[PDB]
Design a protein around this ligand. Structure first.
Ligand SMILES: NC(=O)c1ccc[n+]([C@@H]2O[C@H](COP(=O)([O-])OP(=O)(O)OC[C@H]3O[C@@H](n4cnc5c(N)ncnc54)[C@H](O)[C@@H]3O)[C@@H](O)[C@H]2O)c1
Ligand SMILES: NC(=O)c1cccnc1
Ligand SMILES: [Zn+2]
Ligand SMILES: [Zn+2]
Length: 252
């Protein structure tokens, strides 16, 4: 059973307002590659021109062609980990999910409260005429290698609602996440290296507030010491185990 998974369930089974923070690691088992080798990535492309709002206004194609070359799974679906977290919310334990991912796999899995720190691929906006579109109107053409283009004014500046270099983090969502970390009674990290703000700081904020800390990651992080329970392994495998044990403790 492993003492780690049991204690995690022991903690969750006792909390009425738990919060889950997730990073790229929770979507690896869905087919979406993590941020591994980001250093090298910036050796092939100028981050300023292909991934900043400034480079986007200067030439939209750089961003889109850059995305086409790197984006792998466009029709990925939530894996067991996402569902486990949605089941936890239905059970009255998890009250919120804070994620850095832009894949929306938490919502598609049933989570009702998802705070997206880096935005998402849900919608796009034409910067010239202000038409808005759902990612679904372009997905197929994009997978065929076609740069999205406004169907109303024909502009090529159709920007997705994700945070790019040079623009601020969504303040109000960030505000809600921090408040979340301050009043939760259990804070669990899943698939995040916790290296950069806000991922790197939210755990410490919840820790100061008195929350019980749990982490499930494939590799250790520098924040591991503050966690009450830390599990090494895959989210898609560990999460469903924890939920089962919580149900067992509940019905007993
Ligand atoms: N400049 C830097 O030095 C640096 C380093 C790391 C991250 N970052 C930034 O951090 C942000 C993303 O952070 P993040 O934490 O979401 O992504 P991340 O890629 O940094 O971390 C994902 C974590 O998931 C773990 N993981 C992989 N597969 C897993 C699985 N199946 N189950 C559970 N865990 C698994 C990994 O071991 C890793 O620690 C980006 O903005 C990125 O640019 C920057
Ligand atoms: N899961 C994700 O949304 C994601 C986004 C960008 C890079 N790696 C993972
Ligand atoms: Zn337009
Ligand atoms: Zn809350």
């Amino acid at each position: 059973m492993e003492d780690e998974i049991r204690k995690a369930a022991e903690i969750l089974a006792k909390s009425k307002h738990a919060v889950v923070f997730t990073g790229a690691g929770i979507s690896a088992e869905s087919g979406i590659p993590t941020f591994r080798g980001e250093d090298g990535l910036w050796r092939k492309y100028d981050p300023e021109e292909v991934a900043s709002i400034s480079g986007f206004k200067r030439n939209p194609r750089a961003f889109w062609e850059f995305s086409m070359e790197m984006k792998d799974k466009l029709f990925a679906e939530p894996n067991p980990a996402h569902y486990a977290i949605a089941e936890l919310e239905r059970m009255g334990i998890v009250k919120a999910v804070i994620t850095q991912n832009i894949d929306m796999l938490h919502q598609r899995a049933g989570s009702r409260r998802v705070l997206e720190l880096h935005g998402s691929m849900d919608k796009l906006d034409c910067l010239d005429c202000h038409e808005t579109y759902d990612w679904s109107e372009f997905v197929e053409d994009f997978n065929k290698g076609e740069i999205p283009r406004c169907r109303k004014c024909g502009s090529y500046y159709v920007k997705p609602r994700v945070v790019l270099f040079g623009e601020p983090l969504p303040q109000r969502t960030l505000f809600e996440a921090i408040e979340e970390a301050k009043h939760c009674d259990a804070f669990m990290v899943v698939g995040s290296s916790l290296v950069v703000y806000p991922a790197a700081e939210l755990p410490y904020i919840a820790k100061k507030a008195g929350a019980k800390m749990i982490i499930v990651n494939a590799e250790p992080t520098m924040a591991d010491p503050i966690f009450d329970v830390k599990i090494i392994g895959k989210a898609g495998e560990v999460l469903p185990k924890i939920v089962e044990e919580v149900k067992r403790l509940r019905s007993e």
